[PDB]
Design a protein around this ligand. Sequence first.
Ligand code: ZN
Lengths: 172, 8
Amino acid sequence: NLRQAVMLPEGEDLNEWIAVNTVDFFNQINMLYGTITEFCTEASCPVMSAGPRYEYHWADGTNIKKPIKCSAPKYIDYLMTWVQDQLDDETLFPSKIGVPFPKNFMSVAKTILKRLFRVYAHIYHQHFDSVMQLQEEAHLNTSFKHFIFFVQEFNLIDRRELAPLQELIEKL
Amino acid sequence: YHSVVRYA
Ligand SMILES: [Zn+2]
Protein backbone atom coordinates (compact mmCIF):
# COMPACT_ATOMS: atom_id res chain seq x y z
CA ASN A 1 0.00 0.00 0.00
CA LEU A 2 1.96 2.99 -1.33
CA ARG A 3 -0.47 5.69 -0.14
CA GLN A 4 0.17 4.25 3.32
CA ALA A 5 3.92 3.73 2.98
CA VAL A 6 4.65 7.38 2.11
CA MET A 7 2.99 8.90 5.18
CA LEU A 8 5.18 10.31 7.96
CA PRO A 9 5.83 7.31 10.26
CA GLU A 10 5.32 7.23 14.03
CA GLY A 11 6.95 10.28 15.60
CA GLU A 12 9.32 10.75 12.67
CA ASP A 13 11.15 13.90 11.58
CA LEU A 14 9.82 15.35 8.32
CA ASN A 15 13.24 16.45 7.03
CA GLU A 16 14.69 12.98 7.67
CA TRP A 17 11.75 11.27 5.97
CA ILE A 18 12.02 13.44 2.86
CA ALA A 19 15.80 13.18 2.92
CA VAL A 20 15.58 9.39 3.14
CA ASN A 21 13.06 8.94 0.32
CA THR A 22 14.77 11.49 -1.92
CA VAL A 23 17.99 9.47 -1.74
CA ASP A 24 16.04 6.35 -2.68
CA PHE A 25 14.22 7.93 -5.62
CA PHE A 26 17.48 9.28 -7.03
CA ASN A 27 18.76 5.71 -6.91
CA GLN A 28 15.61 4.28 -8.51
CA ILE A 29 15.70 6.83 -11.33
CA ASN A 30 19.44 6.38 -11.82
CA MET A 31 18.91 2.63 -12.13
CA LEU A 32 15.95 2.97 -14.51
CA TYR A 33 17.60 5.50 -16.85
CA GLY A 34 20.78 3.44 -16.65
CA THR A 35 18.87 0.58 -18.28
CA ILE A 36 17.90 2.55 -21.41
CA THR A 37 21.04 4.66 -21.97
CA GLU A 38 21.92 2.57 -25.03
CA PHE A 39 18.78 4.00 -26.64
CA CYS A 40 19.04 7.56 -25.29
CA THR A 41 21.73 9.12 -27.48
CA GLU A 42 22.66 12.60 -28.70
CA ALA A 43 21.24 11.50 -32.05
CA SER A 44 17.88 10.29 -30.72
CA CYS A 45 17.46 13.05 -28.14
CA PRO A 46 19.16 16.20 -29.54
CA VAL A 47 17.48 18.44 -26.97
CA MET A 48 16.16 17.45 -23.54
CA SER A 49 12.37 17.16 -23.69
CA ALA A 50 9.18 15.68 -22.29
CA GLY A 51 7.62 15.39 -25.71
CA PRO A 52 7.57 18.28 -28.20
CA ARG A 53 5.49 20.43 -25.80
CA TYR A 54 8.21 20.59 -23.15
CA GLU A 55 11.89 21.35 -23.65
CA TYR A 56 14.33 21.64 -20.76
CA HIS A 57 17.55 23.64 -20.48
CA TRP A 58 20.13 22.92 -17.79
CA ALA A 59 20.94 25.35 -15.02
CA ASP A 60 21.70 24.68 -11.35
CA GLY A 61 21.30 28.30 -10.27
CA THR A 62 24.79 28.54 -8.79
CA ASN A 63 27.59 27.29 -11.05
CA ILE A 64 25.37 27.69 -14.12
CA LYS A 65 22.72 30.40 -13.88
CA LYS A 66 22.03 30.81 -17.61
CA PRO A 67 20.31 27.65 -18.96
CA ILE A 68 22.23 25.56 -21.50
CA LYS A 69 20.36 23.97 -24.40
CA CYS A 70 21.71 20.42 -24.60
CA SER A 71 20.88 16.82 -25.49
CA ALA A 72 19.00 14.48 -23.16
CA PRO A 73 21.99 12.33 -22.18
CA LYS A 74 23.96 15.49 -21.45
CA TYR A 75 21.16 17.23 -19.56
CA ILE A 76 20.60 14.13 -17.43
CA ASP A 77 24.34 13.76 -16.80
CA TYR A 78 24.36 17.39 -15.63
CA LEU A 79 21.34 16.60 -13.47
CA MET A 80 22.47 13.31 -11.92
CA THR A 81 25.96 14.58 -11.06
CA TRP A 82 24.32 17.65 -9.56
CA VAL A 83 21.94 15.64 -7.36
CA GLN A 84 24.74 13.30 -6.29
CA ASP A 85 26.79 16.32 -5.18
CA GLN A 86 23.93 17.55 -2.98
CA LEU A 87 23.32 14.15 -1.40
CA ASP A 88 27.04 13.83 -0.66
CA ASP A 89 27.12 17.32 0.84
CA GLU A 90 27.23 16.87 4.62
CA THR A 91 25.86 20.35 5.32
CA LEU A 92 22.89 19.49 3.10
CA PHE A 93 22.35 15.79 3.77
CA PRO A 94 23.67 14.98 7.29
CA SER A 95 24.58 11.32 7.81
CA LYS A 96 26.08 12.09 11.23
CA ILE A 97 24.14 12.54 14.47
CA GLY A 98 25.49 16.07 14.91
CA VAL A 99 24.60 18.07 11.80
CA PRO A 100 21.00 19.25 11.66
CA PHE A 101 19.26 19.91 8.35
CA PRO A 102 19.90 23.43 7.03
CA LYS A 103 17.18 26.05 7.49
CA ASN A 104 16.34 25.70 3.80
CA PHE A 105 16.45 21.91 3.43
CA MET A 106 12.86 21.62 2.19
CA SER A 107 13.58 24.04 -0.66
CA VAL A 108 16.70 22.03 -1.46
CA ALA A 109 14.86 18.70 -1.62
CA LYS A 110 11.92 20.10 -3.59
CA THR A 111 14.39 21.32 -6.21
CA ILE A 112 15.98 17.88 -6.50
CA LEU A 113 12.58 16.21 -6.76
CA LYS A 114 11.35 18.79 -9.28
CA ARG A 115 14.24 17.94 -11.61
CA LEU A 116 14.22 14.18 -11.01
CA PHE A 117 10.65 14.18 -12.35
CA ARG A 118 11.98 15.33 -15.72
CA VAL A 119 13.92 12.10 -16.17
CA TYR A 120 10.69 10.14 -15.73
CA ALA A 121 8.97 12.50 -18.16
CA HIS A 122 11.68 12.06 -20.78
CA ILE A 123 11.61 8.27 -20.41
CA TYR A 124 7.83 7.97 -20.67
CA HIS A 125 7.53 10.40 -23.59
CA GLN A 126 10.57 9.31 -25.62
CA HIS A 127 11.61 5.77 -24.64
CA PHE A 128 8.60 3.79 -23.41
CA ASP A 129 8.96 1.40 -26.35
CA SER A 130 12.55 0.67 -25.32
CA VAL A 131 11.32 0.23 -21.75
CA MET A 132 8.87 -2.40 -23.00
CA GLN A 133 11.60 -3.90 -25.19
CA LEU A 134 13.69 -4.47 -22.04
CA GLN A 135 10.61 -5.61 -20.09
CA GLU A 136 11.06 -3.01 -17.35
CA GLU A 137 7.69 -1.26 -17.65
CA ALA A 138 6.52 -2.78 -14.35
CA HIS A 139 9.65 -1.49 -12.62
CA LEU A 140 9.19 1.94 -14.21
CA ASN A 141 5.47 2.20 -13.41
CA THR A 142 5.79 1.17 -9.77
CA SER A 143 8.76 3.48 -9.27
CA PHE A 144 6.96 6.44 -10.83
CA LYS A 145 3.79 5.74 -8.85
CA HIS A 146 5.77 5.60 -5.61
CA PHE A 147 7.60 8.83 -6.49
CA ILE A 148 4.32 10.61 -7.25
CA PHE A 149 2.49 9.30 -4.18
CA PHE A 150 5.30 10.70 -2.05
CA VAL A 151 5.38 14.16 -3.64
CA GLN A 152 1.58 14.37 -3.50
CA GLU A 153 1.70 13.34 0.15
CA PHE A 154 3.90 16.29 1.09
CA ASN A 155 3.07 18.64 -1.80
CA LEU A 156 6.68 18.77 -3.03
CA ILE A 157 6.22 19.44 -6.75
CA ASP A 158 3.66 21.93 -8.05
CA ARG A 159 1.14 21.04 -10.75
CA ARG A 160 2.67 23.01 -13.63
CA GLU A 161 5.91 21.03 -13.28
CA LEU A 162 3.96 17.76 -13.34
CA ALA A 163 1.99 18.77 -16.43
CA PRO A 164 3.93 16.68 -18.96
CA LEU A 165 2.51 13.53 -17.31
CA GLN A 166 -0.72 14.91 -15.83
CA GLU A 167 -2.78 12.33 -17.72
CA LEU A 168 -0.57 9.45 -16.55
CA ILE A 169 -0.59 10.81 -12.99
CA GLU A 170 -4.39 10.96 -13.07
CA LYS A 171 -4.51 7.23 -13.87
CA LEU A 172 -2.63 6.34 -10.66
CA TYR B 1 16.12 32.78 -16.94
CA HIS B 2 13.66 29.94 -17.51
CA SER B 3 14.78 26.32 -17.58
CA VAL B 4 11.49 25.02 -19.01
CA VAL B 5 10.41 26.09 -22.49
CA ARG B 6 6.83 25.18 -23.41
CA TYR B 7 5.54 24.74 -26.97
CA ALA B 8 2.25 24.02 -28.76
ZN1 ZN C 1 16.36 10.23 -24.62
